[PDB]
């Protein structure tokens, strides 16, 4: 239950505009690897799609 790494999800249907950014499917979900950053929170899609995902459109699932 949110031990060391939490999970986030996309509220809208944000689309990747570049390989660096991570595409999201309004309803998807991943983990959190870098929450220290104020911009992007290096997340990791279950499929294995690692990229900078929008912090705003994102929000820690929390318990």
């Amino acid at each position: 239950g949110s031990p060391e790494e939490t999970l986030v999800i996309a509220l809208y249907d944000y689309q990747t505009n570049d390989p660096q950014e991570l595409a999201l499917r309004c309803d998807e979900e991943y983990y959190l690897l870098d929450s220290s950053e104020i911009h992007w929170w290096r997340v990791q899609d279950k499929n294995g799609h690692e990229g900078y995902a929008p912090s705003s459109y994102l929000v820690e699932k929390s318990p």
């Binding site: 509220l11 809208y12 505009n17 570049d18 660096q20 950014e21 104020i38 911009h39 992007w40 900078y52 929008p54 912090s55 705003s56 459109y57 929000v59």
Partner: protein, 108 residues
């Protein structure tokens, strides 16, 4: 630097006023800047109707000041700019490290 020429630059506005003012826009991408006391380290107020816990929300991206040469201001760990007008424009289009690539400036 005479930033009074640009729009995003606003010193006569404070954070509280910056957060509200941007709120009036009510548009995704709404981005602006706010002068800082620092000798050279303004702040990029980015407003994007997002987040669920708190919406709307204001992102205070304080340009990372890197007292170096060049290496000065930047916000993405990707590339560094020797000026603010660049970081503000480089994000206007193309793509960079910004929750919501700047694409909508605001003014008083």
């Amino acid at each position: 630097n005479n930033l009074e020429t640009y729009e995003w630059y606003n010193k006569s506005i404070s954070r509280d006023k910056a957060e509200k003012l941007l709120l009036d826009t009510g548009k995704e991408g709404a981005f602006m800047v706010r002068d800082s006391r620092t000798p050279g380290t303004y702040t990029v107020s980015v407003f994007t109707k997002a987040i669920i816990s708190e919406n709307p929300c204001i992102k205070h991206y304080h340009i990372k000041e890197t007292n170096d040469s060049p290496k000065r201001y930047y916000v993405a760990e990707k590339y560094v700019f020797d000026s603010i007008p660049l970081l503000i424009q480089y994000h206007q289009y193309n793509g960079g490290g910004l929750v919501t690539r700047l694409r909508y400036p605001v003014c008083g």
